[PDB]
Coordinates of C-alpha atoms and ligand atoms in Angstrom, one line a residue:
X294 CA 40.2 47.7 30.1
X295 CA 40.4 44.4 28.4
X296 CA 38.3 41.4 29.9
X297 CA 40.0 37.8 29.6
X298 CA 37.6 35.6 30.7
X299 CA 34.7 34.4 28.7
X300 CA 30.9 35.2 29.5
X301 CA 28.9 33.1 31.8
X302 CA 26.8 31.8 28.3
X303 CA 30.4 30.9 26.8
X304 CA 30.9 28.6 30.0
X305 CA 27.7 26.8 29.9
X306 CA 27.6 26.4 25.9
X307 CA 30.9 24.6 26.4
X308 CA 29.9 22.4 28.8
X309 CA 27.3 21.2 26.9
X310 CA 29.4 19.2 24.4
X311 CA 36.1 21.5 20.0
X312 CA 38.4 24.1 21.2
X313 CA 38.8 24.3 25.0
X314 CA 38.5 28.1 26.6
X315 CA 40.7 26.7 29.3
X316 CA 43.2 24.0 30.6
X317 CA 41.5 22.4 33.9
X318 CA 44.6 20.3 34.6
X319 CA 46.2 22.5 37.4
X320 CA 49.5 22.5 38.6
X321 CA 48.8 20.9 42.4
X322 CA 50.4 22.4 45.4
X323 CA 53.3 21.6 47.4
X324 CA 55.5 23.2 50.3
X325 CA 57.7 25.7 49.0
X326 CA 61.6 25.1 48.8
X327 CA 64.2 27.5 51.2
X328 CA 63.3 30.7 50.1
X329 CA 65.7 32.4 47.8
X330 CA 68.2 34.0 48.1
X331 CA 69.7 32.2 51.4
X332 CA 70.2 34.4 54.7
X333 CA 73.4 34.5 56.0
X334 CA 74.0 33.8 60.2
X335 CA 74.4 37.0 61.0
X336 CA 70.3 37.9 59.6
X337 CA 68.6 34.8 61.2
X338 CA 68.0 36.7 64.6
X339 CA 66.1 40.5 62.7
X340 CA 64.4 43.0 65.1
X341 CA 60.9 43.3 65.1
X342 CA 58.9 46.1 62.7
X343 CA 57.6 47.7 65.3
X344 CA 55.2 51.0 65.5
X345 CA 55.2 52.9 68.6
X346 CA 51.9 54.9 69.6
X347 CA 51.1 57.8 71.5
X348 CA 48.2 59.7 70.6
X349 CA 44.4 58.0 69.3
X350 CA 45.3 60.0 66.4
X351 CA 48.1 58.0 65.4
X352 CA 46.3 54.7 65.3
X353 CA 44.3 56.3 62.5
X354 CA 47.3 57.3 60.5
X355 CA 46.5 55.9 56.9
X356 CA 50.7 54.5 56.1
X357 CA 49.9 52.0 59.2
X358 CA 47.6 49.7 57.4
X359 CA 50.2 49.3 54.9
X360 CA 53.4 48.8 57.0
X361 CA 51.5 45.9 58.6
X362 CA 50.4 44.2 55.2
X363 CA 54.0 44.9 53.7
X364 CA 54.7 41.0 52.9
X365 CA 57.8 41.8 53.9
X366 CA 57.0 42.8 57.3
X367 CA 56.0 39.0 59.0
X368 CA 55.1 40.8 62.3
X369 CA 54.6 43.8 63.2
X370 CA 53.8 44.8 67.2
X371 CA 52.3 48.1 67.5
X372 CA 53.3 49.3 71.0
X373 CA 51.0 51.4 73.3
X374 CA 47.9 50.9 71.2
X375 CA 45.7 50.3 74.1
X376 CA 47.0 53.7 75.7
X377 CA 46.5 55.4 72.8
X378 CA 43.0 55.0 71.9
X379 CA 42.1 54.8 75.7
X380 CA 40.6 51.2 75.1
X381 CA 39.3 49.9 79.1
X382 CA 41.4 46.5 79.3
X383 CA 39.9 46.0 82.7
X384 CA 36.7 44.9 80.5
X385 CA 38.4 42.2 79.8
X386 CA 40.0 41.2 83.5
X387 CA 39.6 37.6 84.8
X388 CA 37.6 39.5 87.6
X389 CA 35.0 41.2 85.0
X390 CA 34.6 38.3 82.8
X391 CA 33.9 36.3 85.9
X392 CA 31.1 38.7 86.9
X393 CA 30.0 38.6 83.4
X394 CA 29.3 35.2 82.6
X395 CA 31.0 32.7 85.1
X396 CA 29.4 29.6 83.8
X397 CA 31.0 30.4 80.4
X398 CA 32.9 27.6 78.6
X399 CA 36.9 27.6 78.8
X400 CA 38.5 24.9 76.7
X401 CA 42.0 24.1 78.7
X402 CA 45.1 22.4 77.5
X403 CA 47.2 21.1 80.3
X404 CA 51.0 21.5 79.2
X405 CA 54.5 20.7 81.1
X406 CA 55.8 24.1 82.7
X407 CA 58.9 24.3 80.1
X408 CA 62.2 26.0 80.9
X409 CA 62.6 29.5 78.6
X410 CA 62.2 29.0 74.8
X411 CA 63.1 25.3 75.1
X412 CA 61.0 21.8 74.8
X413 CA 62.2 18.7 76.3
X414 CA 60.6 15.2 76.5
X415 CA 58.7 15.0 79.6
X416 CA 61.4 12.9 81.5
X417 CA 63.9 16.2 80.8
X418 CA 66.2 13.7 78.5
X419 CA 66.5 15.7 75.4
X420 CA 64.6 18.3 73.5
X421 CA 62.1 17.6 71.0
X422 CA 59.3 19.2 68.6
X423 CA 56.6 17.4 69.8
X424 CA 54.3 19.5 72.6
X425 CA 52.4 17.8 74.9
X426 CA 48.7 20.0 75.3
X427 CA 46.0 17.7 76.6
X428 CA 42.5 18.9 76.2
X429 CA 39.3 19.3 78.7
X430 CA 37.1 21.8 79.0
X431 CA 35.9 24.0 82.3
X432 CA 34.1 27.5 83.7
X433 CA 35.5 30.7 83.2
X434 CA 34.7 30.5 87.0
X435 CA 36.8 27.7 88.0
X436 CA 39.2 28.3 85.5
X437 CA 39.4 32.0 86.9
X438 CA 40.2 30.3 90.2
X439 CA 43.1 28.3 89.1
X440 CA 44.9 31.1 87.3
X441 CA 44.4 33.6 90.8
X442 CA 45.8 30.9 93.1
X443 CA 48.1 30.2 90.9
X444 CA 49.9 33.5 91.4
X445 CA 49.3 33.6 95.1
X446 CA 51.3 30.4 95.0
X447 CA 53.7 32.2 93.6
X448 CA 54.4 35.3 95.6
X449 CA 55.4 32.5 98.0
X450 CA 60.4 16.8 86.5
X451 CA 58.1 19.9 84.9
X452 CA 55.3 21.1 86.6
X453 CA 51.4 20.6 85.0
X454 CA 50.2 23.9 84.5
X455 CA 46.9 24.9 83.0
X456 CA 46.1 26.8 80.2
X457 CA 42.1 28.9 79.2
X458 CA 41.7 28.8 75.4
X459 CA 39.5 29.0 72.6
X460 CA 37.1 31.2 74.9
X461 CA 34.1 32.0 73.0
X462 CA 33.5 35.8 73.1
X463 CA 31.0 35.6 69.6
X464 CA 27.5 36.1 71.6
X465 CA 27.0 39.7 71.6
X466 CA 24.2 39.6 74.5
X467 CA 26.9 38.0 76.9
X468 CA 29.5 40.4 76.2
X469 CA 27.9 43.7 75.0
X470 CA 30.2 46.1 76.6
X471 CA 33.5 43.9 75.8
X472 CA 32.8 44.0 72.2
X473 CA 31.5 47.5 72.4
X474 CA 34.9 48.5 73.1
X475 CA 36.7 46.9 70.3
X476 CA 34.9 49.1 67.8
X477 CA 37.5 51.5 69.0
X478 CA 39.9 50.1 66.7
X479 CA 40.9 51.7 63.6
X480 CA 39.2 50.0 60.6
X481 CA 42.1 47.7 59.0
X482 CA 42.1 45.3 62.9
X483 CA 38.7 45.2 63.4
X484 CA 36.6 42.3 63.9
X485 CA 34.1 43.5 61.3
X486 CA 34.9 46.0 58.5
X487 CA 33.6 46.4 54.8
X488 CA 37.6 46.1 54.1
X489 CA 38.1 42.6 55.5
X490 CA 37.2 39.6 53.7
X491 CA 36.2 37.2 57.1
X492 CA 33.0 40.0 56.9
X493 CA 31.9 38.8 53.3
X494 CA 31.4 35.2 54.4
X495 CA 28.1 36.0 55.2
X496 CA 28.1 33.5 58.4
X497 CA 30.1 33.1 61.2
X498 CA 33.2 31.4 61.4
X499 CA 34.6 30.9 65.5
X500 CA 37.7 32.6 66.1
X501 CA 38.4 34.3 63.0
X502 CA 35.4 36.4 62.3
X503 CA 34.3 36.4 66.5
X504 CA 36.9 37.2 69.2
X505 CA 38.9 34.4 71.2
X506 CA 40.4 34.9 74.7
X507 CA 42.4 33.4 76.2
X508 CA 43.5 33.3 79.9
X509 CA 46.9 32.0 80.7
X510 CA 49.1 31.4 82.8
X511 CA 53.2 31.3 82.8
X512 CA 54.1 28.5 80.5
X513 CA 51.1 28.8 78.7
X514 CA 52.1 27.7 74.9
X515 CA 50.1 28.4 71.7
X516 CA 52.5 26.0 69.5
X517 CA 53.7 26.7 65.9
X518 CA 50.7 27.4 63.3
X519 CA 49.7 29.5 60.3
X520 CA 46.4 30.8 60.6
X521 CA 42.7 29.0 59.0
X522 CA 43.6 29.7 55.6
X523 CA 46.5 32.1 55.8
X524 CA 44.7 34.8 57.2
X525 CA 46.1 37.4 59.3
X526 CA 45.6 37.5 63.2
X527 CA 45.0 40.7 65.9
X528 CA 46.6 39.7 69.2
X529 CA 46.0 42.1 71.8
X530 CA 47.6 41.6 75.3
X531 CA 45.2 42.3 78.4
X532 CA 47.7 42.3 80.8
X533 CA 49.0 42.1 83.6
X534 CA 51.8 39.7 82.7
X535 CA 53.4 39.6 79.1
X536 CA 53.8 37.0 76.2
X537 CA 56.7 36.0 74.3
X538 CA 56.2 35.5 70.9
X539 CA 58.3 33.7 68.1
X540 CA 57.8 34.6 64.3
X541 CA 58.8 32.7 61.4
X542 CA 58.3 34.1 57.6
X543 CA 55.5 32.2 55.9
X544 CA 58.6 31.8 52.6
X545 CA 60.0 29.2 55.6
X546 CA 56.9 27.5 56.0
X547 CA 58.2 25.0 53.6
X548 CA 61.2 24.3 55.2
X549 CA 59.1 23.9 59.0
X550 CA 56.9 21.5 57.6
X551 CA 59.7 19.0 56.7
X552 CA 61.1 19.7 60.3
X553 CA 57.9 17.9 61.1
X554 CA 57.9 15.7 59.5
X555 CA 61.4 14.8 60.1
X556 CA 60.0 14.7 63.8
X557 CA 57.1 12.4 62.9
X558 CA 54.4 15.4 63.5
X559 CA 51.9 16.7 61.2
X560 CA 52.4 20.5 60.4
X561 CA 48.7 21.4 59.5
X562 CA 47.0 19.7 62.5
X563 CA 50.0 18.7 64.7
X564 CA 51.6 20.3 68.1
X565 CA 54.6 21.0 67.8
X566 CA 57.0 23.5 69.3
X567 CA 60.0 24.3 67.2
X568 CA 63.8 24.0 68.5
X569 CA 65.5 27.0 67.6
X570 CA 68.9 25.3 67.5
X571 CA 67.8 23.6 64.6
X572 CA 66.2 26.1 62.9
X573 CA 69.4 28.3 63.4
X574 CA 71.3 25.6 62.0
X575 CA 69.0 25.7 58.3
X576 CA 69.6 29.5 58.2
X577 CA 65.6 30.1 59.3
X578 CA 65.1 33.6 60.4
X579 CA 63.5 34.0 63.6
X580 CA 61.4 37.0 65.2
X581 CA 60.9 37.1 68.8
X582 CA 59.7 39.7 71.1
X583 CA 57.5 40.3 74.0
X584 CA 54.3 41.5 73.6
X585 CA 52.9 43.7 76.8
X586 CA 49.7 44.6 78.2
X587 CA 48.0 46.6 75.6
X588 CA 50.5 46.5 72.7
X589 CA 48.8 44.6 69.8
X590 CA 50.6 42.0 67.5
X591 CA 49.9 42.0 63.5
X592 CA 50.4 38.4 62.5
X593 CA 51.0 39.1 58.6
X594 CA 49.7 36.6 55.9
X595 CA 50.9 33.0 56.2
X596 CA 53.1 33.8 59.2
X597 CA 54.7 31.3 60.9
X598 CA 54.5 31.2 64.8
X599 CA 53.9 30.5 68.2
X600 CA 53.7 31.9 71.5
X601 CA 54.0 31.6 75.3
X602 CA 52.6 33.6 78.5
X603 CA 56.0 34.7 80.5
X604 CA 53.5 36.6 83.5
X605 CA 49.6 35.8 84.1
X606 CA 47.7 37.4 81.5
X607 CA 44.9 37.1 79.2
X608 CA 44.5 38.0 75.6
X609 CA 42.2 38.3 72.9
X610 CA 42.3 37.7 69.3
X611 CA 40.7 37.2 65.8
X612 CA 41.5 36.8 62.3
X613 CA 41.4 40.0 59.2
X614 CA 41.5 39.2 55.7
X615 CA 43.0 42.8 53.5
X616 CA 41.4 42.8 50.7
X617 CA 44.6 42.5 48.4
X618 CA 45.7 40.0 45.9
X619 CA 48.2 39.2 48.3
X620 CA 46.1 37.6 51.3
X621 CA 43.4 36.2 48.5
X622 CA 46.5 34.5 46.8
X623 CA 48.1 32.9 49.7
X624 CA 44.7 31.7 51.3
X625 CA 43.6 30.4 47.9
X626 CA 47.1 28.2 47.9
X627 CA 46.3 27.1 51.6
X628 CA 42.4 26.1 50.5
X629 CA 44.1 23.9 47.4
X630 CA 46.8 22.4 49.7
X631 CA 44.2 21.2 52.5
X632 CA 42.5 19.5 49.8
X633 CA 45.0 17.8 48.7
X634 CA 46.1 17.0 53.0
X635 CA 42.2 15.9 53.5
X636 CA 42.3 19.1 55.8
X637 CA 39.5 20.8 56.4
X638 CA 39.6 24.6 55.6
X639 CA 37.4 26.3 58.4
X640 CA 37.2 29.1 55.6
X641 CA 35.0 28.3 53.1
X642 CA 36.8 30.1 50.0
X643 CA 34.6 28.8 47.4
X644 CA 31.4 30.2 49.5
X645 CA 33.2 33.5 50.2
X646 CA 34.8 34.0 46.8
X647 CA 31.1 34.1 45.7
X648 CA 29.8 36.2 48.4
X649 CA 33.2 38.9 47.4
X650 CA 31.5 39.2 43.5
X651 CA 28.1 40.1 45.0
X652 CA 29.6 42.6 47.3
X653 CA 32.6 44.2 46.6
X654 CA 33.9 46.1 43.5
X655 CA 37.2 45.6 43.3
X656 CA 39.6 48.0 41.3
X657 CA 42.7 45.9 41.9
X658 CA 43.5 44.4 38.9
X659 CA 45.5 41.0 40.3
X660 CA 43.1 40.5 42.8
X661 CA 39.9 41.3 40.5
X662 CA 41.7 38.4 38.0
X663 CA 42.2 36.2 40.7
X664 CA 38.6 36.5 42.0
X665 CA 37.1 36.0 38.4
X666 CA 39.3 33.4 37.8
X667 CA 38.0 30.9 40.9
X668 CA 34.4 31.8 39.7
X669 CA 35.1 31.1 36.7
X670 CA 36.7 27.2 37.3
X671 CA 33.9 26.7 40.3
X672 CA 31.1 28.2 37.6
X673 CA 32.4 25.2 35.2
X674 CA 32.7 22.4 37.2
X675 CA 29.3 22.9 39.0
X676 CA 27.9 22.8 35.0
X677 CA 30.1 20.2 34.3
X678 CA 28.5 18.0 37.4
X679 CA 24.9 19.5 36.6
X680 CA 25.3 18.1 32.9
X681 CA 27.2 14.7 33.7
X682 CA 23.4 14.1 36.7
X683 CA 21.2 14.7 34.1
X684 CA 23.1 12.5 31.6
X685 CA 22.5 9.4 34.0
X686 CA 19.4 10.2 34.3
X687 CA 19.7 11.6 38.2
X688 CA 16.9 14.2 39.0
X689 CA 18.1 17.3 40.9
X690 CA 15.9 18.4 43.9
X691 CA 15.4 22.3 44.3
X692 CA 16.3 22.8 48.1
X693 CA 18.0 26.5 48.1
X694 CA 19.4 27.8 51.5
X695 CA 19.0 31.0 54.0
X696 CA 20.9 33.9 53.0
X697 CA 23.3 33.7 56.6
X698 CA 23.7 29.5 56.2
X699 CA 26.6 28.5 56.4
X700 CA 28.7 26.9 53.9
X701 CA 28.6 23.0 53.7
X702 CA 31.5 20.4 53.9
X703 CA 31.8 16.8 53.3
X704 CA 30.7 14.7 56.5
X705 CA 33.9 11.9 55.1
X706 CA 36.8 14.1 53.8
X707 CA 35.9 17.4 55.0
X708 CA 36.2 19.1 51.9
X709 CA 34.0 22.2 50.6
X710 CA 30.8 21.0 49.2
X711 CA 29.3 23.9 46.6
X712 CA 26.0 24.3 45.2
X713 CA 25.6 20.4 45.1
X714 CA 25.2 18.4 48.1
X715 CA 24.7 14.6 48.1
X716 CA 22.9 13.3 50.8
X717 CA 21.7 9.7 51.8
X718 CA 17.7 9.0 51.6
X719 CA 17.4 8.3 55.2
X720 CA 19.3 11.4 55.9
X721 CA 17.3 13.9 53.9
X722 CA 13.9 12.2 54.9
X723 CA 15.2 12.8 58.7
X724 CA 16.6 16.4 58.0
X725 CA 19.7 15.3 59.3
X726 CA 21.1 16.9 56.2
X727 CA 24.4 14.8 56.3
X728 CA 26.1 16.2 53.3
X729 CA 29.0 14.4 51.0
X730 CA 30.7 15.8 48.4
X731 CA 30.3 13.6 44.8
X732 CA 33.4 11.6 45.0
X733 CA 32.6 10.3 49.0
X734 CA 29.1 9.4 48.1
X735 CA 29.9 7.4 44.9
X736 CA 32.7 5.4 46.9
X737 CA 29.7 3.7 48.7
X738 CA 27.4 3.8 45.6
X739 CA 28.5 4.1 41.7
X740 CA 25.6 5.2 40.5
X741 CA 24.7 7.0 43.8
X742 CA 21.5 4.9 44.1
X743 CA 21.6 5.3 48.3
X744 CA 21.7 9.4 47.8
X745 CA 19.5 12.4 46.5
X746 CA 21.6 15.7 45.4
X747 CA 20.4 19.0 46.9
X748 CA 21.1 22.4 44.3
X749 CA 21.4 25.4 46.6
X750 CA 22.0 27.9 43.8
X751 CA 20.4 28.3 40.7
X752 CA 22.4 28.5 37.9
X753 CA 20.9 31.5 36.4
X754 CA 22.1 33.3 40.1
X755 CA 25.5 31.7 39.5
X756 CA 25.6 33.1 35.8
X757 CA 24.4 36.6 36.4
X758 CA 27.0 37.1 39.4
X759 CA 29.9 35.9 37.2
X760 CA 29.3 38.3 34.3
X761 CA 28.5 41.3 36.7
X762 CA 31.6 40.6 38.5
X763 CA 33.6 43.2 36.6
X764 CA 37.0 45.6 36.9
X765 CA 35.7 48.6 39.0
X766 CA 37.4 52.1 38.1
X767 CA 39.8 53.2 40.9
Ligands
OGA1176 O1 47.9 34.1 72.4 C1 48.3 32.9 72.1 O2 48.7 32.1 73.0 C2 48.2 32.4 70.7 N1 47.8 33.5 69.8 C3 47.8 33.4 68.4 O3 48.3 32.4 67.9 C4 47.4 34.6 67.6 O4 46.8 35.6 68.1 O5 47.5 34.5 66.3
CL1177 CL1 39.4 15.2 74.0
NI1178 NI1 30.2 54.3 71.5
NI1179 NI1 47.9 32.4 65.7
NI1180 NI1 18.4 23.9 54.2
ZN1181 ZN1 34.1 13.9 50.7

């Protein structure tokens, strides 16, 4: 085993000026091309990779974990997987959560009632991208109301409809039993596992590392999206009605942002719900299914999609990171690319690439050299900025952190802010804590006169985690 990186001493001695130990210029990211080579018409429409359960037993079969991380494999729907390991779905009824907690906070998104897989403007002219999803915010109670007179109404120029999401089911003293029952789960779809990188952030991040539900009802449209960062998603369907889902491989993602832009909408932080004429037309392959009560959708690294209630139903989900190179990789990409988009990226990879060399011993080659490699350019530029302070002449004030606080972003642009946090004098005096990252502060003072700069790590931490982060045996 041959290491490539240099020591933590080697990093510092060079920042204290030569030969360079490595280039810093980086190649900046951009929206991959139509993947190669081109799919023919008659591959654009492929069936689902689908596993069908019977017995708990086969939930826990080892070859499933890697069927669903198979980057070839977008989707995958795992049929009967509520059945199978018995899980009580009625914990998770409109009537129980109601009983639960019926003050709870519901965000809603009021939408047009659209016909099938289509979107039109709202005068029912044409179709277009853009999806109209207003937002307010309600009781579980009220909304609960809505959703059961709203199929009454049924057993007897779009219509609004209503639609419960972003439900917050993190609080484990409001909803003991729900999550209770989710530790059912084999390991690799869990909420929390030693195996999935959302657990190693060390705090928590809403809707990826806590469950989301949602309560719907038919119309109800989660438009196109990749995940926070490329991770992958656990959708399981509570029933009674199903969803349709439509899946796009994250190789197209590429090609989907310059639909939407060619539409005048933002890909990262737009609505948009994607025509599938025209995606058709520029040989995108699309997966779409329906998911029903108690099957469970794998939403693989980076996958395109979006998805619509065709019954009344609810459904929960969260996020998983696999520890492979594969989802470290692709949610590295999606960290540099927000930067770039002034996006911000809800996971903090800096913070949690850190918190993965204090924790886990990874054997995987790639991944371990990918890994090493972010501490090692984070390790030098927080040195670099450390060396170019004490230059000017700017003092550094000692203000560490709690173990479980939570990573820190820029209060302007959003971006991560690591180990250095500049903050105005009236804000630290006030413990308002309003942080900047270096550039935003210095674009309202050069010589950052109007700020103090917070150090949450020492350096010798930061040194002695780098050079025990090493290549564990298999
Ligand atoms: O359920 C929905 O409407 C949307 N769900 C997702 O986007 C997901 O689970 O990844
Ligand atoms: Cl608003
Ligand atoms: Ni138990
Ligand atoms: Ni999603
Ligand atoms: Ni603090
Ligand atoms: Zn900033």
């Amino acid at each position: 085993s041959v290491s490539i990186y240099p020591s933590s001493a080697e990093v510092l001695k060079a920042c204290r000026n030569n030969s360079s130990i490595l280039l810093d210029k980086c190649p900046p990211p951009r929206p991959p091309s139509s993947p190669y080579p081109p799919l023919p018409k008659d591959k654009l429409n492929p069936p689902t990779p689908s596993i069908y359960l019977e017995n708990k037993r086969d939930a826990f079969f080892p070859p499933l974990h890697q069927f669903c991380t198979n980057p070839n494999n977008p989707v995958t729907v795992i049929r009967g997987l509520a059945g199978a390991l018995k899980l009580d779905l009625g914990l998770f009824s409109t009537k129980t959560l109601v009983e639960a907690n019926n003050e709870h906070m519901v965000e809603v998104r009021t939408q047009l009632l659209q016909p099938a897989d289509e979107n039109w403007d709202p005068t029912g002219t044409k179709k277009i991208w853009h999806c109209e999803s207003n937002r307010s915010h309600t009781t579980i109670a009220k909304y609960a109301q809505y959703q059961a007179s709203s199929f009454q109404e049924s057993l007897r120029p779009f219509k609004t409809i209503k639609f419960g999401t972003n439900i917050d089911l993190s609080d484990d003293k409001k909803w003991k039993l729900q999550l209770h029952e989710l530790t059912k789960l084999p390991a690799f779809v869990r909420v929390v596992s030693a195996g999935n990188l959302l657990s190693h952030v060390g705090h928590t991040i809403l809707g990826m590392n806590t469950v989301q539900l949602y309560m719907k009802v038919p119309g109800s449209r989660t438009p196109g999206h990749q995940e926070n960062n490329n991770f992958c998603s656990v959708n399981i369907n509570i029933g009674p009605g199903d969803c349709e889902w439509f899946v796009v491989p994250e190789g197209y993602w590429g090609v989907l942002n310059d639909f939407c832009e060619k539409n005048n909408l933002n890909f990262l932080m737009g609505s948009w719900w994607p025509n599938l004429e025209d995606l058709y037309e520029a040989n995108v392959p699309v997966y779409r299914f329906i998911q029903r009560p108690g099957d469970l959708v794998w939403i693989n690294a980076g996958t395109v999609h979006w998805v619509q209630a065709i019954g009344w139903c609810n459904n929960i989900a969260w996020n998983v990171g696999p520890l492979t190179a594969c989802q470290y990789k692709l949610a590295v990409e999606r960290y540099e690319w927000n930067k770039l988009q002034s996006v911000k990226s809800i996971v903090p990879m800096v913070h949690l690439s850190w918190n993965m060399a204090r924790n886990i011993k990874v054997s995987d080659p790639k991944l371990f050299e990918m890994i090493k490699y972010c501490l090692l350019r984070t390790l030098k530029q927080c040195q670099t900025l450390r060396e170019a302070l004490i230059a000017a002449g700017k003092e550094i004030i000692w203000h560490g952190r709690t173990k479980e606080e939570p990573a820190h972003y820029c209060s302007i642009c959003e971006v991560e802010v690591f180990d250095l946090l500049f903050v105005t004098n009236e804000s630290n005096s006030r413990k308002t804590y309003i942080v900047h990252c270096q550039d935003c502060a210095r674009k309202t003072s050069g010589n950052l006169e109007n700020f103090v700069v917070l150090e949450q790590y020492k350096m010798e931490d930061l040194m002695q985690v780098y050079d025990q982060f090493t290549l564990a045996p298999p």
